[PDB]
Symmetry: D2
Subunit: 116 residues, 4 copies
């Protein structure tokens, strides 16, 4: 599992469960190709997005569908999504955790990058 | 101006000065059309991006070129850029400030929407 | 004024208005002595806390009464208060802004230190 | 383990390892009594601070020694520590994770509270 996403809710003090996440990879022609997608579990985690074979070097975009999350809770939020765009694996394979902490009008995101 | 951008640096404890910021508006075919851009001032602010007449309801993306900012300071960054995507809604307050707080491997962003 | 406090609300997307803020200075016996206090304005800011003559090097604590803020808005909060503890250093820049971004179960804080 | 602390480094993109953490509990006389302490592991986590017997209702302060962390990395940071003050267990026992994300001039903190 070289790519994991973790999402927390700053209003509830809980994991953000059932959050849709879409990952894109920039293609040769500079468009964003779908790469993988999933949704967070009861613990706010999304495992199993990709494999070390498929997760090659590239520029990746992790789109966390925050609007749909808040709307399902009955809240009208500010942002459409939280986006995280980064070059991956450019000095060899790494493991990436992308974490996000959500509020209706704000979010924060961080990356934890480790070398297997 | 109905749209202001403020950028801060969490490593140096300072405004993020001379950061490129690009604003896009989502077009009918779901593509992102350039809308406004500029660089942040000595106070980390970018004023004058648009006018009330131009800034209609729609989906907007603010892209902050964080990678170039960090590189100009000699610091190794994670992200290509920081992106903030939101809907402008006339039912809410009329002035939008998009604030971002930057670190090499993280960022925070908030909206301050006032009348 | 060498010390300003700015408070924002991440739930409403607004300044955090009428929030009590208390500043303390660490005394020789390691106790916290009251130094300055006030409430944030309509812009979420608290100006005029101190003067250059009064604000000497030392360890300071800024306590933001977040629990009362959230309760006055009808929102259930986690923290008793948000605390920011730092050393004022004359070797660095001369104006300190302590900024805080509040959510019910989280907060962010940064320092903007400029000349 | 009803109280866990997790600390991340926003400069390195890593767990914050070897961070000292001190927990205090407000006593009857309004002073801060030492309650427990420890340091984060290689994963940025601190487990084993307390037990469900000892972790009674009260007002707790979790002090994360950020200054000492940054100084050990050769960096002069702004804050002395990151402090998190909260009432715990007032509607019965809960499990609390206090997470912090550190930069030299900034930090963010959140709580994840779950009911066993
Ligand atoms: C963006 C951000 C992430 C975090 C991440 C917290 C966290 C991260 C992990 C992880 O897998 O890296 C796990 C947990 N748990 C287990 C609560 C919590 C915390 C704060 C305060 C933040 O502002
Ligand atoms: C902790 C924190 C502070 C800020 C600060 C925003 C800010 C906004 C204004 C404003 O005029 O809207 C002013 C300032 N100042 C005065 C530093 C700061 C932003 C984010 C995303 C944060 O996580």
């Amino acid at each position: 599992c070289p790519l994991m996403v973790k999402v927390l809710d700053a209003v509830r003090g809980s994991p953000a469960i059932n959050v849709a996440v879409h990952v894109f990879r920039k293609a040769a022609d500079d468009t964003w190709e779908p790469f993988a997608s999933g949704k967070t579990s009861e613990s706010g985690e999304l495992h199993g997005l990709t494999t070390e074979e498929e997760f090659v070097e590239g520029i990746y975009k992790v789109e966390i569908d925050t609007k749909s999350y808040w709307k399902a809770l009955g809240i009208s939020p500010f942002h459409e999504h939280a986006e995280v765009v980064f070059t991956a694996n450019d000095s060899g394979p790494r493991r990436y955790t992308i974490a996000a902490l959500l509020s209706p009008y704000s979010y924060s995101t961080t990356a934890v990058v480790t070398n297997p």
